[PDB]
């Protein structure tokens, strides 16, 4: 059983933590209590493996950055499909990403999270699909922690791409 | 970004940060705060310091990082070893003192998941004795919450290697009853899977779980070390259980249970030199002596436990 050190990245509020402990635990996370750092392990099976994925769930605002990347196999950068600023923030944590692990080949996942506020969104997710093509056809979806849509979908992807 | 922050730890090898307000001068009261639970969740566990040879429950008043600080000093109090050997960290885990009535009441998830993943740890590390169907039981119970739905084609044959039965059985018979189980933990698994009665809400099955190990004599018991002589006279080292339901003792070396005591049906009396407690095992004409450093706690926990029935 390999195990896979996965990192939730993003801004702050865009549901980091509740996407994890829904993924988890099952549970939705309604009170917005900022993280510091929290790390959580599951077992799940992806392509018929038996896997330890350690997630680590960031803080939206953090010298730590650097030493997650550096350890980190995959990454899911989220953004609230709520928040325009949330969305802007990616590039620069895409950036950071490549930068410090000195290559174009990270396992990586953007997340429109927040699809349950289909009312409120500020983003489309055509924007979203833009933004993933752009960053070399990176895998993209959108994703309610409320709801459950696609949470599972953004660990099984990243450990796909790590086993590549 | 300046503050100051610590690692709470759960069984199973995740954290939270949490934010210490006041330095290595925090209390477990405050830490507890820290953590994302509600005065539901948190009645029921508590800041525990652990190394690998000690662990201790803390209480609200506890200030958590000066027994980290303090922790040579405390395992030379306490224990035989070496101080400079092990560094502590800091667990949320169940409170010792918990009556086993109230934990019945819970319905909270994250409580239940929390009260299972301890529960799992023991289970595997061989703490909990119970009959072999039991364990069995609760092998299938682990196979439908961690592998979900049996599967004919995934489950069928040679699945149950010595890897996935590690995470299913206690160690202590990873080798020796378990891969004779096989047949009887997957036809339960296959039962549980195909059961339209049994929910599959995951917090449904790990309180499933949870019945199943409540009535085990050793559930949620603090553990300590010490040793007992036996005839012609030899040392064997054992782990002493205290629980909300009595004594138990555990051969350290095997984790076999030796004795097993209800309240009310056992006294005790603590050594004159704190380093020591007898057994008399009222109404069962039986005695005996285990010499630990730990043996004030034991006592003092005891006692607690034992005077919380009424
Ligand atoms: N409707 C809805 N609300 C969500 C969703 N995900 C998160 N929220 C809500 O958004 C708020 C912030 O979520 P949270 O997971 O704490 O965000 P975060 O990215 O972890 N924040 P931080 O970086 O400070 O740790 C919470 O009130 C949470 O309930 C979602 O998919 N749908
Ligand atoms: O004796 C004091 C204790 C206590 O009051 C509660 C829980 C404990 C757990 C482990 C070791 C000691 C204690
Ligand atoms: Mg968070």
Redesign the pocket.
């Known amino acids: 059983m390999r195990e896979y050190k996965l990192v939730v990245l993003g801004s702050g509020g865009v549901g980091k933590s509740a996407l994890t402990v829904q993924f988890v635990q099952g549970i939705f996370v309604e009170k917005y209590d900022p993280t510091i750092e929290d790390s959580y392990r599951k077992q799940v099976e992806v392509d018929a493996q038996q896997c330890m994925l350690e997630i680590l769930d960031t803080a939206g605002t953090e010298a730590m950055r650097d030493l997650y990347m550096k350890n980190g196999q995959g990454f899911a950068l989220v953004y609230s499909i709520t928040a325009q600023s949330t969305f802007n923030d990616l590039q620069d944590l895409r950036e950071q990403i490549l930068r410090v692990k000195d290559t174009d080949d990270v396992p990586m996942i953007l997340v429109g999270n927040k699809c349950d506020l289909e009312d409120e969104r500020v983003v489309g997710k055509e924007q979203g699909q833009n933004l993933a093509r752009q960053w070399n056809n990176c895998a993209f979806l959108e994703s309610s922690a409320k709801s459950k849509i696609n949470v599972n979908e953004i660990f099984y992807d990243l450990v796909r791409q790590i086993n590549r | 970004k300046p503050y100051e922050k610590v690692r709470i730890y759960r069984m199973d090898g995740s954290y939270r940060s949490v934010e210490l307000k006041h330095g290595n001068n925090t209390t477990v009261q405050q830490i507890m705060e820290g953590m994302r639970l509600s005065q539901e969740t948190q009645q029921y566990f508590t800041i525990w310091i652990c190394s690998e040879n000690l662990?201790?429950?803390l209480?609200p008043y506890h200030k958590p990082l000066q027994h980290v600080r303090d922790w040579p000093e405390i395992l030379a109090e306490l224990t035989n070893l070496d101080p400079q050997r092990e560094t502590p960290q800091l667990f949320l885990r169940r409170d010792?003192?918990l009556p086993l009535e109230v934990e019945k009441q819970i319905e909270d998830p994250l409580a239940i998941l929390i009260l299972f993943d301890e529960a799992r740890y023991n289970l595997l590390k061989g703490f909990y004795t119970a009959p072999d169907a039991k364990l069995i039981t609760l092998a299938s119970l682990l196979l439908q919450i961690v592998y979900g739905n049996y599967e004919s084609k995934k489950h069928k044959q040679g699945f149950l290697n010595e890897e996935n039965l590690k995470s299913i059985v206690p160690v202590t018979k990873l080798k020796s009853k378990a891969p004779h189980w096989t047949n009887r933990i997957l036809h339960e698994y296959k039962n549980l899977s195909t059961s339209e009665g049994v929910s599959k809400e995951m917090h449904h099955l790990q309180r499933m779980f949870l019945q199943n190990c409540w009535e085990i004599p050793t559930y949620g018991a603090?553990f300590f070390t010490g040793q007992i002589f036996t005839k012609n006279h030899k040392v064997i080292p054992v782990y002493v259980g205290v629980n909300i339901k009595g004594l138990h003792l555990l051969n350290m070396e095997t984790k076999a249970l030796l004795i097993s005591l209800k309240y009310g049906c056992f006294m005790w009396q603590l050594g004159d030199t704190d380093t020591c407690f007898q057994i008399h095992s009222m109404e069962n004409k039986m005695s005996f002596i285990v010499h630990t450093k730990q043996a004030g706690?034991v006592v003092?926990?005891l006692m607690?436990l034992n005077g919380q029935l009424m």
Do not use: F, M
């Open positions: 662990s201790l429950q209480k010792v003192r603090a706690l003092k926990l607690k």
